[PDB]
């Protein structure tokens, strides 16, 4: 398994497991799950009410010092009743490490904003509200950031179609750019590329 297989890191896996135990034991009020992946990445899944305390602890603790917020993302998984999974990626320059903090919310429940901890969260969760419709309570200035000014609907949700519901064209009668119901000269062709055979037995789900 030498030339064509990715070498495995075990010291980092042990250190990340120990730090996951450390965090999940310091904060039992919000932490629900702690896992470490195959490629040595630590994910801490927490309750949505403890977004501010967990992030402030990870930012300010002497043994954490996660001073950088790299990326803030939402993921749309429609089969869950809390379909939106909000993911914080943090970087610690003191210990040269990275962590992942995950929480959940649905369409109608707001999430506490983390601008008071990290200042990149302003534009990041403004984009999250724009694309997934997740409201962030106690935000300084929450509006749209990437979509059109009159756009209706959140495009990164999975029930939103690839091509939207409206399209723009210039009309000479009103001398203006107008929005009309979408009609495609060629329909986007859907491809069924999924193999009917199981690829990875290690990820096999148990039957009902």
């Amino acid at each position: 398994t030498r030339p064509t297989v990715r070498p495995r890191n075990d010291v980092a896996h042990k250190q990340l497991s120990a730090f996951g135990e450390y965090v999940a034991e310091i904060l039992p009020k919000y932490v629900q799950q702690v896992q470490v992946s195959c490629f040595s990445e630590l994910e801490i899944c927490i309750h949505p009410d403890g977004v501010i305390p967990v992030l402030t602890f990870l930012r300010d603790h002497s043994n954490a010092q996660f001073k950088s917020l790299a990326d803030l993302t939402a993921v749309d998984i429609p089969t869950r009743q809390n379909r939106f999974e909000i993911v914080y990626n943090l970087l610690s320059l003191r210990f040269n490490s990275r962590i992942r903090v995950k929480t959940y919310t649905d369409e109608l429940t707001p999430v506490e904003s983390s601008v008071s901890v990290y200042k990149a969260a302003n534009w990041y969760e403004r984009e999250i509200w724009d694309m997934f419709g997740v409201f962030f309570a106690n935000h300084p200035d929450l509006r749209r950031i990437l979509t059109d000014y009159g756009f209706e609907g959140h495009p990164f949700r999975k029930d939103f179609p690839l091509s939207g519901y409206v399209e723009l064209r210039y009309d000479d009668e009103v001398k203006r750019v107008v929005a009309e119901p979408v009609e495609l000269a060629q329909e986007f062709r859907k491809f069924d590329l999924n193999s009917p055979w199981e690829a990875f037995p290690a990820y096999r789900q148990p039957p009902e």
């Binding site: 062709r189 193999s195 199981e198």
Partner: protein, 688 residues
């Protein structure tokens, strides 16, 4: 309990005795690769792909044929199981041709898929491959035997299910080939299933050849309407054009097979279509016109008619929604002359009770029977999958089959009692040995064909068969939940029409002819312009111009079964719905929408606007038409027996002859099949 305990990857599972290693691994969600094993075929065990390792045992076993004993641990992902899989895949791909871009199995090939999943990634073969001479087995199946892997599903299917025994293996060693050894056409009613079960591209569909690729086809699950079995199919389209038809899986109807007419009628579905409303001009020729003109002319002629001056005939490919729309429209003008082309006797109980015009047991209830009597029908061609079920029960359950009628070929051995109805009279009188056999039967089953009821003495035949059924069911050892009387239908629209209250047969029209006739796809030619009065206004509504369209005055283009969501009832009373695959071509519309618009123009608007309100009205007329994929029971056999004993119709001397005696008569039945070039090729192949 008799269950034993085995372990799959250390996980305990209780299995029945006689279970194989493959089924035990399937019980926990692990699918061992196969190339020759099929769950509906006998076990051959020659591909050796399923070689799994049992722990504490220095030999891999074939999981498709090895039974499990207690305490066994199966290692589905161990090192030597993977080594065996890689070796067998290498041997399978050693002599395979490099034909993947030019072969129709690409993208849906089992060999490609479990070579990518379980095999190696490169080839050590430094020799030359073999080449096999291609064969000709008919205009339906394209044969390229260089791609064959000698899995022998061909012979097992053709011998155990189709019952033909024409395919075989000739040769020895690497020169062994699969074929018929002579220039013989493997022409059966179940030939395309050998295309379905071939794991490689060795057998392919000739009409489908070189047309599409499997990843780009959109799949729509629908119901076949080509016969009254009610087979579930998947229509695969591509950019709004119907490409091919595959079977769906339904364990109680058509388990994974379909007939050849179902598989190859689509090329006629895309020919000879009606795409625009037509009216007669002043020279008497059908010219194109708009929807408004044709609807206004039909409504204006309908407004002057009242009573028995307007009638309607229903064809063989008509949905329940159009039937109830036409019934409501004609009832708004106070007319009850709604007829079907297929004749059913109304003497006695008639179409009131559902027990005397249904396949009362089940399609899947033939597995539980022990003695089956078929009267005056050829089930091989009227309902091929019903005959497949009878053959399966004959093979595995050791069924006893006897037939009254012409000695046709049924792909199993039966007892030909004769072809006279006096034998039916003699069975109920106890003067026959088969009467004693029926009395000794624990689960008897008497099947009467719909084609035997088309005769002038059909009511007497039905009365005699029901007399036999009620003599057996009341007296002999039948519990009461077992239904003996059965009727096999051959028209997809017949049961839905009989449930909604249509009068079977066109005798009502022939009694008092109307001055305005509606034809809903009635292409059987039962009523022509000679029977009708001198100036009759005939309105035809359908998708194909075959028989009724030249004699019509207004032609209203309808939709086919692949172009609308529709409700169809099969011969056992089960209701099913067909989804929309494509849209009707040109100016053609949905049938009930046409009838509703015609009602709106005439000022007699029906109280439904969308499809769901039409189905609500359908539930109002009969509640079993809106419960899909459910079979409802039908009691009150004694009441129908008591009612049928009143009028004593005299039996005739004519022998019971089915209309479909050979394979030649099977292909061309209705307007869809008659417009198919593939059916013409099949008829030309079987006649030469």
């Amino acid at each position: 309990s008799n269950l034993i305990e085995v372990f799959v990857d250390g996980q305990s599972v209780m299995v029945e005795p006689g279970t194989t290693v493959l089924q035990a691994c399937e019980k926990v969600g692990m699918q061992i690769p196969r190339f020759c094993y099929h769950e509906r075929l006998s076990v051959a065990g020659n591909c050796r792909m399923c070689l799994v390792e049992i722990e504490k045992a220095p030999k891999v076993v074939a999981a498709c044929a090895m039974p499990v004993m207690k305490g066994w641990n199966i290692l589905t992902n161990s090192e030597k199981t993977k080594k065996a899989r890689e070796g067998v895949m290498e041997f399978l791909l050693a002599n395979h041709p490099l034909d993947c871009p030019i072969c129709d199995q690409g993208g849906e090939c089992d060999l490609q898929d479990q070579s990518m999943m379980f095999g190696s990634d490169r080839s050590r073969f430094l020799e030359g491959k073999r080449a096999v001479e291609d064969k000709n087995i008919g205009p339906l199946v394209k044969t390229i035997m260089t791609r064959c892997i000698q899995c022998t599903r061909c012979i097992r299917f053709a011998s155990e299910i189709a019952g033909v025994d024409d395919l075989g293996t000739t040769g020895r060693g690497n020169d062994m080939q699969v074929g018929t050894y002579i220039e013989k056409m493997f022409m059966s009613e179940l030939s395309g299933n050998i295309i379905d079960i071939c794991p490689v591209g060795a057998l392919t569909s000739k009409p489908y050849a070189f047309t599409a690729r499997p990843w780009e086809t959109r799949k729509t699950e629908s119901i076949d309407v080509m016969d009254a079995v009610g087979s579930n199919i998947v229509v695969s389209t591509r950019t709004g054009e119907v490409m091919r038809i595959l079977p769906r899986m339904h364990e109680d109807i058509n388990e994974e097979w379909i007939s050849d007419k179902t598989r190859f009628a689509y090329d006629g579905l895309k020919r000879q279509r009606l795409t625009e409303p037509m009216v007669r001009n002043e020279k008497g020729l059908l010219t194109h016109t708009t929807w408004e003109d044709a609807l206004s002319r039909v409504a204006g002629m309908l407004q002057s008619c009242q009573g028995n001056d307007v009638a309607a005939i229903a064809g063989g490919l008509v949905d329940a929604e159009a039937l109830i729309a036409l019934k409501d429209l004609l009832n708004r003008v106070d007319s009850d002359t709604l007829c079907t082309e297929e004749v059913f006797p109304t003497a006695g109980a008639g179409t009131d009770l559902r027990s005397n015009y249904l396949l009362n047991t089940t399609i899947a209830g033939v597995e539980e029977a022990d003695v089956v009597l078929l009267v005056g029908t050829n089930p091989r061609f009227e309902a091929p999958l019903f005959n497949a079920r009878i053959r399966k029960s004959w093979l595995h359950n050791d069924l006893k089959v006897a037939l009254i009628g012409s000695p046709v070929d049924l792909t199993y051995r039966y007892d030909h009692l004769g072809d006279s109805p006096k034998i039916l009279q003699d069975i109920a009188s106890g003067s026959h040995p088969f009467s004693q056999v029926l009395q000794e039967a624990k689960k008897p089953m008497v099947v009467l064909g719909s084609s035997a009821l088309q005769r002038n003495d059909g009511a007497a035949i039905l009365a005699a068969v029901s007399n036999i059924a009620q003599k057996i069911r009341t007296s002999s050892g039948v519990t009461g939940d077992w239904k003996v009387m059965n009727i096999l239908h051959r028209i997809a629209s017949q049961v839905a029409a009989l449930d909604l209250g249509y009068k079977p047969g066109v005798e009502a029209i022939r009694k008092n002819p109307p001055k305005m006739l509606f034809l809903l796809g009635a292409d059987g030619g039962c009523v022509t312009r000679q029977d009708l009065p001198k100036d009759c206004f005939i309105v035809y509504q359908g998708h194909h111009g075959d028989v009724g369209a030249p004699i019509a005055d207004v032609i209203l283009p309808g939709a086919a079964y692949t172009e609308k969501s529709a409700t169809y009832v099969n011969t056992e009373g089960r209701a099913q719905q067909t989804k929309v695959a494509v849209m009707p071509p040109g100016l053609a519309r949905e049938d009930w929408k046409i009838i509703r618009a015609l009602s709106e123009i005439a000022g007699m608007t029906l109280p439904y606007d969308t499809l769901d309100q039409v189905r609500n009205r359908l539930e109002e007329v009969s509640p079993n038409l809106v419960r899909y994929d459910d079979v409802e029971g039908a009691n009150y056999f004694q009441q129908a027996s008591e009612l049928s004993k009143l009028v004593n119709q005299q039996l005739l001397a004519d022998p019971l002859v089915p209309p479909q005696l050979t394979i030649k008569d099977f292909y061309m039945t209705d307007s869809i099949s008659r417009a198919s070039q593939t059916m013409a090729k099949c008829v030309k192949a079987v006649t030469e």
